[PDB]
Design an enzyme around this catalytic site. Structure first.
Site, PDB file in Angstrom:
ATOM      1  N   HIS A 205      -6.390  -0.718  11.490  1.00 57.16           N
ATOM      2  CA  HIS A 205      -5.902  -1.173  10.467  1.00 57.16           C
ATOM      3  C   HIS A 205      -6.960  -2.255   9.979  1.00 57.16           C
ATOM      4  O   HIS A 205      -7.784  -2.783  10.385  1.00 57.16           O
ATOM      5  CB  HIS A 205      -4.925  -1.911  10.565  1.00 57.16           C
TER       6      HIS A 205
ATOM      7  N   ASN B 210      -1.386  -9.333   4.883  1.00 58.23           N
ATOM      8  CA  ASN B 210      -1.906  -7.820   5.468  1.00 58.23           C
ATOM      9  C   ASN B 210      -0.838  -7.142   4.361  1.00 58.23           C
ATOM     10  O   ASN B 210      -0.957  -8.233   3.129  1.00 58.23           O
ATOM     11  CB  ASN B 210       0.005  -7.301   6.599  1.00 58.23           C
TER      12      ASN B 210
ATOM     13  N   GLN C  45       0.979  -1.560  -0.009  1.00 56.77           N
ATOM     14  CA  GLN C  45       0.035   0.139   0.148  1.00 56.77           C
ATOM     15  C   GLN C  45       0.451   1.608  -0.285  1.00 56.77           C
ATOM     16  O   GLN C  45       0.474   2.146   0.134  1.00 56.77           O
ATOM     17  CB  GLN C  45      -0.913   0.363   0.885  1.00 56.77           C
TER      18      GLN C  45
ATOM     19  N   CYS D 126      -5.420   0.657   3.616  1.00 58.18           N
ATOM     20  CA  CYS D 126      -5.705  -0.463   4.090  1.00 58.18           C
ATOM     21  C   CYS D 126      -7.143  -1.057   4.106  1.00 58.18           C
ATOM     22  O   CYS D 126      -6.949  -2.484   3.760  1.00 58.18           O
ATOM     23  CB  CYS D 126      -5.035  -0.592   5.434  1.00 58.18           C
TER      24      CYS D 126
HETATM   25  C1  LIG Z   1      -4.880   1.867   7.183  1.00 61.11           C
HETATM   26  C2  LIG Z   1      -3.706   1.737   8.397  1.00 61.11           C
HETATM   27  S1  LIG Z   1      -2.571   1.580   8.027  1.00 61.11           S
HETATM   28  O1  LIG Z   1      -2.173   0.566   7.375  1.00 61.11           O
HETATM   29  O2  LIG Z   1      -1.867   3.317   6.970  1.00 61.11           O
HETATM   30  C3  LIG Z   1      -1.814   1.636   9.980  1.00 61.11           C
HETATM   31  C4  LIG Z   1      -1.511   2.692  10.044  1.00 61.11           C
HETATM   32  C5  LIG Z   1      -0.526   2.290  11.661  1.00 61.11           C
HETATM   33  C6  LIG Z   1      -0.269   1.580  12.313  1.00 61.11           C
HETATM   34  C7  LIG Z   1      -1.632   0.375  12.046  1.00 61.11           C
HETATM   35  C8  LIG Z   1      -1.738   0.443  10.582  1.00 61.11           C
HETATM   36  C9  LIG Z   1      -5.654   2.897   6.772  1.00 61.11           C
HETATM   37  C10 LIG Z   1      -4.896   4.302   7.629  1.00 61.11           C
HETATM   38  C11 LIG Z   1      -6.162   5.673   7.459  1.00 61.11           C
HETATM   39  C12 LIG Z   1      -5.387   6.747   7.702  1.00 61.11           C
HETATM   40  C13 LIG Z   1      -4.875   7.624   7.573  1.00 61.11           C
HETATM   41  C14 LIG Z   1      -3.759   8.755   7.563  1.00 61.11           C
HETATM   42  C15 LIG Z   1      -3.435   9.313   9.234  1.00 61.11           C
HETATM   43  C16 LIG Z   1      -4.134   8.475   9.199  1.00 61.11           C
HETATM   44  C17 LIG Z   1      -5.427   7.554   9.481  1.00 61.11           C
HETATM   45  N1  LIG Z   1      -6.842   2.762   8.607  1.00 61.11           N
HETATM   46  C18 LIG Z   1      -8.332   2.884   8.212  1.00 61.11           C
HETATM   47  O3  LIG Z   1      -8.517   3.329   6.649  1.00 61.11           O
HETATM   48  C19 LIG Z   1      -9.404   2.273   8.658  1.00 61.11           C
HETATM   49  C20 LIG Z   1      -9.902   0.519   8.420  1.00 61.11           C
HETATM   50  C21 LIG Z   1     -10.886   0.555   9.612  1.00 61.11           C
HETATM   51  C22 LIG Z   1     -11.572  -0.621   8.767  1.00 61.11           C
HETATM   52  C23 LIG Z   1     -12.932  -0.215   9.504  1.00 61.11           C
HETATM   53  C24 LIG Z   1     -13.309   0.149  10.507  1.00 61.11           C
HETATM   54  C25 LIG Z   1     -12.170   0.678  11.306  1.00 61.11           C
HETATM   55  C26 LIG Z   1     -10.884   0.955  10.971  1.00 61.11           C
HETATM   56  N2  LIG Z   1     -10.322   4.120   8.857  1.00 61.11           N
HETATM   57  C27 LIG Z   1      -9.938   4.810   9.484  1.00 61.11           C
HETATM   58  O4  LIG Z   1      -8.922   5.087  10.225  1.00 61.11           O
HETATM   59  N3  LIG Z   1     -10.682   5.690   8.829  1.00 61.11           N
HETATM   60  C28 LIG Z   1     -12.704   4.923   8.577  1.00 61.11           C
HETATM   61  C29 LIG Z   1     -12.781   6.791   8.016  1.00 61.11           C
HETATM   62  O5  LIG Z   1     -13.099   7.416   8.399  1.00 61.11           O
HETATM   63  C30 LIG Z   1     -11.465   7.941   8.166  1.00 61.11           C
HETATM   64  C31 LIG Z   1     -10.411   7.209   9.303  1.00 61.11           C
END
Ligand SMILES: *[C@H](CS(=O)(=O)c1ccccc1)[C@H](CCc1ccccc1)NC(=O)[C@H](Cc1ccccc1)NC(=O)N1CCOCC1
Length: 215
Positions: A162, A182, A19, A25
């Site tokens: 995540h 992952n 990614q 993610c």
């Molecule tokens: C993906 C996460 S990651 O792989 O970048 C990660 C980072 C650090 C530790 C572990 C994993 C993504 C990151 C979003 C983000 C981007 C920039 C800054 C901060 C956060 N996470 C998501 O997209 C999550 C996924 C999720 C799915 C279902 C339930 C809960 C979480 N979603 C999330 O961050 N958002 C939900 C929609 O609104 C925006 C926030």
């Protein structure tokens, strides 16, 4: 029911992806699930497009995050259930910026009709996965940065942040575990995968499970 199930062994899982610096993610979790479900519906294993969701799914926030359930719904309600192939709509958000949505010049790789949300119970999710295939799940991956291998018997389980893919489990091992794909390249963890203890809601793995429905 089975003591152990590994969908990679049935050739139902595509290779581990990357990614990059984009917080997409949720898109890899959603697409990875569709890839497996499509194969299990009797079609050849096809790499699908995460970029399609990151660029076109406006019910989500691209590199700023999203929800697997919102993605499934968008595909069905906004894109006529169509999911493009990866080679026709390549990933181009690795730098942290998602390019604008292009509505043409792509090939349909798979189609879905909807999605189901599994119960918040690991035994029930396992039973469903053993028969129906890989499940998209959300977890607390704050402890995952330092993971290098082995079964993680202790995971910080406080806040979902995540999206990943459950591809199997093993109740026969010393410590039963979940096999999780992952999206941080094959250099992370056990060739891109991670195994966490099963049964004690490690990393809040049972809280948000779901899967797309094909055909
Ligand atoms: C993906 C996460 S990651 O792989 O970048 C990660 C980072 C650090 C530790 C572990 C994993 C993504 C990151 C979003 C983000 C981007 C920039 C800054 C901060 C956060 N996470 C998501 O997209 C999550 C996924 C999720 C799915 C279902 C339930 C809960 C979480 N979603 C999330 O961050 N958002 C939900 C929609 O609104 C925006 C926030």
């Amino acid at each position: 029911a089975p003591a152990a199930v590994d969908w990679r062994a049935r050739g139902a899982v595509t290779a581990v992806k990357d990614q990059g610096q984009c917080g997409s993610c949720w898109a890899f979790s959603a697409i990875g699930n569709v890839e497996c479900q499509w194969f299990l519906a009797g079609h050849p294993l096809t790499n699908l497009s995460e970029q399609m969701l990151v660029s076109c799914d406006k019910t989500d926030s691209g590199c700023s995050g999203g929800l697997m359930n919102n993605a499934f719904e968008w595909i069905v309600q906004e894109n006529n259930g169509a999911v493009y192939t990866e080679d026709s709509y390549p990933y181009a958000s690795g730098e942290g910026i998602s390019p604008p949505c292009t509505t043409s010049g792509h090939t349909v790789g798979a189609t879905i009709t909807g999605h189901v949300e599994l119960p918040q119970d690991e035994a029930q999710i396992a039973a469903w996965l053993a028969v129906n295939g890989p499940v998209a799940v959300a977890v607390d991956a704050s402890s995952w940065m330092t993971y290098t291998g082995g079964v993680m018997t202790s995971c910080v389980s406080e806040q979902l942040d995540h999206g990943v893919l459950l591809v199997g489990y093993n109740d026969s091992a010393a410590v039963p575990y979940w096999i999780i794909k992952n999206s941080w390249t094959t250099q992370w963890g056990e060739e891109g995968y991670i195994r966490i203890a099963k049964g004690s809601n490690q990393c809040l793995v049972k809280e948000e499970a779901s899967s797309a429905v094909v055909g």
